[PDB]
């Protein structure tokens, strides 16, 4: 959901 | 190239 | 939360 | 604004 210290969109 | 780019916060 | 995010290939 | 290992969207 943004630009944080934990991932959101990691790999593909 | 191939890393997390958009993150949570 | 203060990480620099997107990159250049 | 893409993938990679050098910063393009730093803290703003």
Swiss-Prot record, chains A, D:
Spans through the membrane:
none
**Record note on what altering residue 7 to C/D/E/F/G/H/I/K/M/N/P/Q/R/S/T/W/Y does:** Loss of RNAP inhibition and loss of bacterial growth inhibition
Q: Summarize the record's induction comment.
A: At the onset of stationary growth phase.
Domain of life of the organism in this record?
Bacteria
Residues the record marks as site: Essential for permeation into bacteria and for RNAP inhibition = 9
Effect noted on mutating residue 10 to A/C/D/E/F/G/H/K/L/N/P/Q/T/V/Y: Loss of RNAP inhibition and loss of bacterial growth inhibition
Q: Where in the cell is it found?
A: Secreted
Q: Where is this cross-link: Isoglutamyl glycine isopeptide (Gly-Glu)?
A: 1-8
UniProt site positions, description: Essential for permeation into bacteria: 4, 7, 10
**Protein's job:** Peptide antibiotic that functions through inhibition of the bacterial DNA-dependent RNA polymerase (RNAP). Inhibits transcription by binding deep within RNAP secondary channel, where it sterically blocks the folding of the trigger loop, which is essential for efficient catalysis. In addition, it also seems to restrict access of nucleotide substrates to the catalytic center, and shows a partially competitive mode of inhibition with them. Exhibits potent bacteriocidal activity against a range of Enterobacteriaceae, including several pathogenic E.coli, Salmonella and Shigella strains.
Protein name stated in the entry: Microcin J25
Task: Please spell out the taxonomic lineage of the organism that makes this protein.
Answer: Bacteria, Pseudomonadati, Pseudomonadota, Gammaproteobacteria, Enterobacterales
Q: Which residues of the full protein are shown?
A: 38 to 48 of 58
